[PDB]
Here is the input.
Amino acid sequence: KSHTICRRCGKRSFHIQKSTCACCGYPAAKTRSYNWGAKAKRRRTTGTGRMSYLKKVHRSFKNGFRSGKPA
Amino acid sequence: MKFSRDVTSSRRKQRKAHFGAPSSVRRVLMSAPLSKELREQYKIRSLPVRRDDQITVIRGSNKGREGKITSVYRKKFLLLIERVTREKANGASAPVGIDASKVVITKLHLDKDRKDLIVRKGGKV
Amino acid sequence: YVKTWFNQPGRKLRRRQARQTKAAKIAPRPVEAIRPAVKPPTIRYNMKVRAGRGFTLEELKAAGVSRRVASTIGIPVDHRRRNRSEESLQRNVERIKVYLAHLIVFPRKAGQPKKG
Amino acid sequence: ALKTFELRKQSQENLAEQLQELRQELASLRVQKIAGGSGSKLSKIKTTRKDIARILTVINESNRLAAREAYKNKKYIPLDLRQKKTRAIRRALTPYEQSRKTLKQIKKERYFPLRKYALKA
Amino acid sequence: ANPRQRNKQRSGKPRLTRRNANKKAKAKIYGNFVIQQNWDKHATLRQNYARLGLLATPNYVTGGVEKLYPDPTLDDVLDKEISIAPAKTEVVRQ
Amino acid sequence: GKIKNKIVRQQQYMKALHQKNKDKLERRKERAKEEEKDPEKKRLRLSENIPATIESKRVYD
RNA sequence: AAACUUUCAGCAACGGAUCUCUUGGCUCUCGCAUCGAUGAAGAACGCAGCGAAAUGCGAUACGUAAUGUGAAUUGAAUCAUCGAAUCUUUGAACGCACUGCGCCUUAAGGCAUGCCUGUUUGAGUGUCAU
RNA sequence: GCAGAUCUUGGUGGAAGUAGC
RNA sequence: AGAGCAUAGCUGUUGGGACCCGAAAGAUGGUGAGAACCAUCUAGUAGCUGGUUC
RNA sequence: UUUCAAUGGCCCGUCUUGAAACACGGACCAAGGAGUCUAGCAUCUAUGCGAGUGUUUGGGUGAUGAAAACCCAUCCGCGAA
RNA sequence: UUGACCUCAAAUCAGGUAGGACUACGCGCUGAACAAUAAGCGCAGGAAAAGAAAAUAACCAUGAUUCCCUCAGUAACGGAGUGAAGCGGGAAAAGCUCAAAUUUGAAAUCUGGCAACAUUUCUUUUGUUGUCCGAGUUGUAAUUUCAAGAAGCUGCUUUGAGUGUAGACGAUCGGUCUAAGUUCCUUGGAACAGGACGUCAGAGAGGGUGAGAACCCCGUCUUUGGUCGAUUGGAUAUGCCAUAUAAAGCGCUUUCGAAGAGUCGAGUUGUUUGCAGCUCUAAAUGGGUGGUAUCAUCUAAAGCUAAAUAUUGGCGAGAGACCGAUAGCGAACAAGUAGAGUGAUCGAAAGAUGAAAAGAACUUUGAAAAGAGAGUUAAAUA
Ligand SMILES: [Zn+2]
Here is the structure.
């Protein structure tokens, strides 16, 4: 078992000896990504998760991110 | 013909909108025509169906049957009417659903909201 | 790499709406500025008269319009071009003067302090 | 259930043990229901959960409004009281400093503004 | 098809529909009140300028104009003065 | 009905069908034991539960 | 003869073609401009209905408030709108390791790094004035 | 517009209730 | 004492993956531990092989 | 249509070479499956106009579907002088 | 000893900012095979970049940039191939800011703290006024940018970075307003079909409903608009203030007129004339680039800038002579899922009962799975 669970992506691709994930490059700040891996990119890009905040941003754009309360 | 480009005549999009509507939209989707007496007295052609409404079945096998609306099953676009049922194998009476457009309202379940709605659609109470 | 033109009718309509949107913002004044009349710079076309960029400072001075107010009434200024012949000077001074003959300039409000 | 509109018409420390009593009630009812309960039991679980949610909403809204009043017309306020539109929107030039002009530009627009005119055909 | 678009399809949340699609619609006039009062919201901007007695362009037009009906010396330029020009229509007179 | 996946909805049907058979079998086995213990119960069930036929449920004229 | 073999036909299996369908794809066009240290994208763990190999939500856990619509789900809502609140552990991830191990102040507040403007406290055999 | 491409996908045969476990 | 220009169809021909299919290049970027493995350039190819529908 | 009698009658496709033969491909059935699109050039034919010819880069315009149809200012391509 | 200044520091001091993600379309640094390509790396926005000539030309001259058509598959390079540009026609048009000259009869300039006063898409946002400190003379304002301009003189024409109110015209968001058969006969499980008689149409789009529905329902047309919520655009009109002892344009000159250096350029090496390294290194009617083979044109080594343009991503929308479940996205359903691999990665198959579950009660055989009598349905040859 040369790989364990990654603290960032949660996959069993964290090389124990090198302490580097082969999926996301943890603990590097920039997530691992390659343009030749188009299929790999679409498997973990924006949209494959909750987008809990991004949906809120899209919802609030129409009224202009307004605040306050109605009269 | 439609001329607004804000309304789609696509069958794919119209079927998707009807069969994926929320319950607020489904409330207006299941509307029934008022009877002639109610039509000339409330100045309204049709209204959304509500529980305890007194209706008459106009089409289908149960044509002519009267009764109150016991429940408005919005998840199936069906109406449940009192004593309009079907016998099962074990003897229990399974209620029969009738589309809201196939019934006519003969007596309204008037409340404060319905009266305001009536005068909202140009209707004298 | 192929450049298709399926948006050719769409671009025609989009530019027309920009003209109407501009005219909605500036209601009574033309959607274009007045361009001078110049001669193309070659022996093949020097007999043609086409539209220039703006009027030279010597053209504006002769017609009576200062270069600071010319832009305010829709008269472009070309500091680069010059009048090498008296014909170009006369062709474009008259163009300015005819423009000023057909121009209604609406007055603006001015602040007049009460004291001196 | 409880009405939100008359819940805001109560004192702050009154809402404290009302939340406390509601929390023990939910915990006690859950202890009752895990040993056997009817379908109505989970109905009052739903109502008491929303009632606790309504209770905590009033406490947080009242505290938030108090903080806003205490920090009114103060140069620096906590981040939770500050606006949250978009990181870029917060970094942008404000309309006041967007409209700042030099005295050279002020004189140009004071004496030679873009006139309103029309061309007769 | 995109995972973002698949994500919002699988959701039970409604889409942020906006209805702004109405072509053939021309911008309404603000600015001059006299122009707005006499403007024809159906006619094009060239047809409205011509009807109002105004010039939509002080230069040439870069195509053919619409024909709806079958119609039936430096001293004397820098020193001459042109006495304005007549107002063809009532709108220009206002 | 609720499941628009063909494989899942027939997996759910097979699960429910097996559950229905088990409870019916248990009720039948326990009914046989009590009716064996008291033959009068078997007489009551047979007399009361006569299978229906179209001749028996023919509309009245 | 019978059997077997073969052929043909009927019925029954097997199989899933054809036809018809279609809340899907694909393509074109049009409008718009909106992520993040005020913690994003992504990951994990929970919640409650479940059929999840789906969805929604975050210990206020199908969400709460407000504006509605107005009687269901299958002031109601597994509803719409949406300006207020809440939003677990993570992750650029930030007290150190990566859940332990810590520090300071009053369970809470906190405690990453670089850089910019300012504030305060110091040092210098720095240059000068007394 | 198919009979072939040691064609692609799926379905089904004889071998054969044989080799065998 | 000009006969051309434009469009359409047909046929031929030259390029584009160019009738379909069939040999490994090589290079770039990674994974695992010299060699191996993965993904894109790349429809890089077969002077040929097989097939090519009333 | 099944069968019988009399007469005849080889297994197709490819490749080979003189035709072969031979060697290749073919267990069966269904579905899918191979000269296409585009840019040039030349030929022929049709059509419009003709010493001319070509509206659609673009502008105008299109009240109901407006990516269509309709109209053409200045250039320009080819041809001819 | 103290103080001023400089320098080095420190602080859980106050106030800010950077990282990461997405990259269809920007712009950079790179870089193979075979193309200035893929891949790698860096940086952005709603567009980016470019941009107001150290530009063309040789004419009767043009006049920032960008994009389209044309030039033109031309010149040129090198026969093949590579392959522009000036002109011309269109789309859109908008211009400017500094450095370099003394405010010198007055640092006229700015950040921050504190205190009041307002203001808000907003108790969340923005400022204003006062005071103190700091920045700054090793230079912050006004003035000037070569198209000029400064300083004088001159008599013409000009002038608000203010704050209210009202109405109108626009934009956005959320409510609200809506014509006419379910009449008769026949078939059918069902009428939405057929036949008869009607009705409405600025509505005969589409969808739903037990079979082909303008009139049963949602809608569609009116709507390129009436009527209410709230937000905000530019103007108009009218008050109240207006620090004008001020600030501008155009006349005139017996007075002046600053213009960007390890840069241009020269030599030599690579990449591709550009760029870069290296050695050297300027000028003031100078310098750059062209036509002469003297003339023409431009004014670099500092900066900003909307529109026309691009857009496989994102937020929506409308379509289609497209595909119709071995097709069309890998994915019409569970789909980047199940599953495979230490991992990078790879990756499916799988749609349809009926109008309605009315999903087969009950009796009976069997250990059970199930069978058989029955029963539902218009049909279980659903
Ligand atoms: Zn990882």
Residues A 6, 8-9, 11, 13-14, 21, 23-24, 26 surround zinc ion (CB under 6 Å). The two ends of chain C are 71 Å apart (CA to CA). The first helix of chain C runs from residue 8 to 25. Strands of chain C lie at 37-38, 50-51, 103-106.
